[PDB]
Write a protein that binds this ligand. Structure first.
Ligand SMILES: [Mg+2]
Ligand SMILES: [Mg+2]
Lengths: 284, 284, 284, 284, 284, 284
């Protein structure tokens, strides 16, 4: 009778809510009034209005946002009949080609639904060709069974969603109104190849000579950052973190994250050879 | 062998025609030469050319259009072999998430087909993420079985279709060349909340003070309308139709429609308190 | 467990490669290192870099391109473990409405996948509503079983793909570095109807009077072509090829192709009545 | 003490008025309330408001406009103190390089003045590099002595002015509310040279072959005109008016004007050779 | 030998300086290092570099700016040979049509000079058609004798200059680093006519009914102003200042200025009839 | 009777010609048919048509162009009545503020004239606020007496003219069809200050560290130039030509010009310290 899409919607779309600050979608994940959405939906208003698909409206309190992840948590007070809940899936089970259903509640009285698949898997955003629109953003992304596997964002036609397993790791902290830790050092960085460095040094108009190595080229030192304060300059080649050699910027990020906030890291750089200690700080 | 899409197409795509005035698609709904399409396809030409998927061309007479609904009826003369017919479904059975197939015949010799789902259900347009293109517009929107459930229009990526059950109510009148009745009074109107009226009255630069009530705020009086002729002004709050209180613009529309053409309605308004009688007229 | 999309991807996505000249996708079609892609991906670089989904990189030699078809062949040297291969389907079995899966490898370490259907069938491009993006272009278009039925191009939302059976006819020639033959004469041409010619001649501002016939109107003589060299002018009506009457430009194309390169064709034209011989030349 | 500009302004700027319909400048040319301005200033309002530099306001009646010349006449009722008057010069005495002073009264309480020279002399517009602005348009253009030699228009930096001697020929008719005669036939026409016709006929993509002559090529037949009604077509070469040969479009214009309204002219044309009679009509 | 322009330049152009913060022109008005320019040239840098036409460079201290007037004063230390000085004229002697010469020193080693006239006389800006360019802005505007009558700004082709007599009234205060007083109340205001109020009240879509009077219509209440704090709303009609009736916004401005800073004014308003006291504050 | 502008025009405007290749102005400078104009007017056509203000047309031969100066020489054959000639002035006598008159002949039958002054004096272009338009470009720029002091170009409102004394130095060579020598080395170069180099080195994102000196910073090495072939790189600081120190790019240009074509220059550079020999080549 019903397609599998209409069925998944029937499972999880009741709990998809409209969110208005004076706008987008979110979804209730616990009978106690915990609601997930995007930071772009709510921030920086601390007061929102939630509307259930059934037309019940609630005074929503923004519990906190994490701009780095584009996630926020809103709480409402469960009065009267029980709040419908969307069941959460696991995004680590996704495969490219899995069905993907994007549900909004932009009006408050019905769901908006679009269908597509998982297009890419890496925030490590899920990519999908399920059309993602305003108002549909901040709503859930379901798998074929109707479980939440992600949170739509309005970021072609390809759309991005925050994997659910990332929200599930951040949810406690955001509900408590705390700051999610995001350590960084503040450089735009690029993996540099020796063929790329010799190629660079052949060009009379490259901005700077590069020491013909496999490394992490500092492309830019962001203002106000630990990297600027440590004295790092554009054109520096990062050759290793403390001891371990590196040629991959993505690996450097993971070393900085595993360090934590307010940790000193020692960097091996070429400018000459130069070691500098950077104090990780919170990305803002 | 064939997917369900290819099957539905085989059922109803024979009857999808190309329409040219010197362009878009339509479909034959009766063996006697009755064809449905959009008003935007044909109007305001009274003579079109119809081409069947099989390459037979016919001199088409536009029987009439309804611009308010975006619907038109074209008739051809069934000579020779029988005209293929698309079977009509029922749009009141649709659910969000149901499959949706948009078929055109822009060239005249083959169908254009796109696949998506029903995205929203409210003209109360069907929304679909089945890509709707020029030339594909005015063609049918099928369900998974191949029955017509709507009429594509070229109005993201989200597309709009006129539900079939609306055409089926208008079809006799348009085929006879009559005017479909569309009574209105000629106001852009907005539901006003007391928190919205107090919020409005807090702003030194709101255009006008609003009497702090739940009502229908007149946002604009359209020129040449029954509302202008009755003396209604921007900033009037409609408080009730005759007797019945109202705070919903959508409800006012339904009262005006249920009235009919050339009917006097009594409006309760705040400007002071003021009653005015409006004479419904045909929307054009 | 896996949808049919995820399964087809598992079948053929291993062989989808990233292609970089200093960018797009291609796919290995033979264990000996033969790779297909678009001409737009590679041309006019004769050296590219191929990356398999598994992260193995190869020094790719562009074997040749055919700009008219938008096809190119790249060869790599199969060292070590065997190159994964995508199985080729047959595009003459496609029907509109058949599922269509567009696979890229833009990064080199994973597939990009989008889902849609066959939208049109006529280069006679496959049209699909499977979203086709940069980086996803030059990759394969699969059927529901995972066989290659086409080659994506970045040419709405509707996308174009080169049918596989066309590549399969060109592949030997391109791999050998030869030129695919594309004979033409160099006219923009239009089928002219007597109602269209009388309609034209009614307009005081038509550029030229047309002899009120069914023919092939020469709309433009391209510079440097066999048609310019034969003396053909804009406004000429082609009435027949040698002996056979013609009113269809598409038929004229097929007569010129069946002729071959450096073949004289005799054209019957109205300007007066005038016969001219054109020497087919290679389209560039 | 005063430059010659300030002196000319003192002479004629009192009579420069502001004109508002709910805007631009004009000037009083007779103590009885006759005011000149542009058609663009006033049309198509029949009621304007005039303001003298001294702040006196008058209810102005538009007496008529001539859109072809961009001239209009406004009348006011001289009550109280006498209306200041600008003295009229003669534009046939102008030479290129003569000083030119453009005066407006956009506000109503002061003049706007700009200085430049006569740049070109051919409506046969005076060109000047005296900056001509909105509000300054419709005001007078003075010579170094302060006499009106033209009427500014807002048509680089080069500005256009209607020569005074043209207004002086139209003024009686416009004041009486009559229509100024402007006979025409309705063709965009071009002088054609034999080198230009042979050059044209060499181009395979010229719209039409031209009979290799010195003539008046009809470039376009305007819709609704005497030329369309006479059957003239684009690509016709006009070879002579009745009897007199012609190769100059500007000469043809003067023959049509000297004819008058509703006069039959016989045209010698090449299409073949063809004579057609055209009935001059009023340009609108 | 020299035109009068070249002579005036020789008189005052020596003292025209280039001003750079890391740009525009200024001029020395006193042998002690006092320099005038625009606020837009310098603000908000407190340190600039001055260059004399002779190539001497000085470390300039910005003494203060008045953004409302677009004026600033820069001081340098007169070492060595005496600073050249431009003599100041009087702008109250200007007449429209007087010659006007705009001098810059954008490079530092020569003057830029343009010639035009005084176009309008009302900050009450001088308008001129002497071309005013970047780098030429902040330099002096001379009369035919070479005296400074204004200060160019880069605010068609019409240019604006600050009259010298306004600078001369502000110069002491700016040199001392004080704030020039600019009292205001914070309303966009419009003179309203009874024909304009009846015309307004005829329009069903005017934002508000106007009490059919000659007054000062409050068009907007600027945020953060004395008018917002006094409770004035858009659509209020100001009928009088304390006691004196008013229908002219320009007159209200002069009453507020003559009041001074931190003065209470009583306003007669229609909304009903309503009196409100406003506390003048400094325009920023 | 006539202003001084009309008089200068009468002196030199007869010799101002229209130039068409299938457009702009030029002027006859010798009774033997020598005509000056801009390179932009004619190049790269070797055949033009000249029209005298009196309506005589001549077959013009382009004798050569110098793109670096924007100058060209056209020759015609003096048949019949004598060619009118414009007398040449001397641009080294110009002063800023001197009157300047720009004359064109765009139509062929009259002059276009605009008036302004000399705005700047440095190709070392004359700047003027005499409006310079298409068609007026390539015509002469006169002084108040009517002598040619420059050649208008269509390069605000400020216009550029080539000083006559530069043409007079190039004229023989261009008339003979030779190449004017323009030696260069091919660097975009900038005077660098120690405060600018320390300022640069403070910025973490400057492309390169600069050795804290007064020099000539190489900003860019143009492709295909003597500088690229000598191995000069972006970021090099030129410290001296052979022996003589330099901190001024304009001085370096004059040393290269005084060298001539195909001369070796020795450059002192910082990169380290480095000397390189550059072979001057012709600027193209
Ligand atoms: Mg889709
Ligand atoms: Mg000017």
């Amino acid at each position: 009778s019903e397609s599998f899409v209409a069925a998944a919607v029937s499972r999880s779309g009741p709990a998809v809510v409209r969110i208005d600050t004076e706008q987008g979608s979110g979804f209730i994940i616990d009978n106690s009034g915990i609601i997930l959405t995007n930071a772009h939906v709510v921030d920086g208003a601390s007061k929102v209005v939630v509307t259930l698909r059934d037309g019940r409206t609630f005074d929503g309190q923004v519990r906190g946002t994490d701009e780095v992840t584009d996630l926020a948590v809103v709480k409402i007070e469960p009065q009267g009949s029980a709040l419908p809940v969307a069941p959460l899936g696991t995004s680590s089970n996704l495969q490219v080609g899995d069905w993907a259903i994007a549900v909004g509640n932009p009006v408050g009285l019905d769901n908006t639904v679009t269908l597509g698949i998982i297009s890419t898997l890496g925030v490590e955003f899920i990519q999908t060709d399920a059309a993602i629109n305003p108002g549909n953003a901040g709503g859930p992304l379901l798998n074929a069974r109707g479980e939440v596997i992600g949170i739509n964002t309005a970021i072609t036609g390809i759309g991005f969603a925050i994997p659910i397993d990332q929200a599930k790791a951040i949810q406690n902290t955001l509900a408590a109104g705390g700051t999610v830790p995001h350590p960084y050092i503040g450089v735009q960085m690029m993996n540099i190849t020796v063929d790329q460095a010799q190629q660079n040094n052949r060009n009379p108009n490259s901005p700077f000579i590069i020491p013909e190595v496999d490394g992490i080229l500092v492309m830019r030192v962001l203002p106000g950052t630990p990297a600027e304060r440590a004295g790092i300059r554009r054109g520096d080649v990062i050759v290793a973190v403390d001891g371990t050699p590196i040629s991959d910027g993505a690996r450097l990020q993971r070393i900085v994250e595993q360090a934590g906030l307010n940790k000193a890291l020692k960097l091996d750089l070429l400018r000459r050879r130069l070691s500098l200690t950077v104090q990780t700080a919170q990305l803002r």
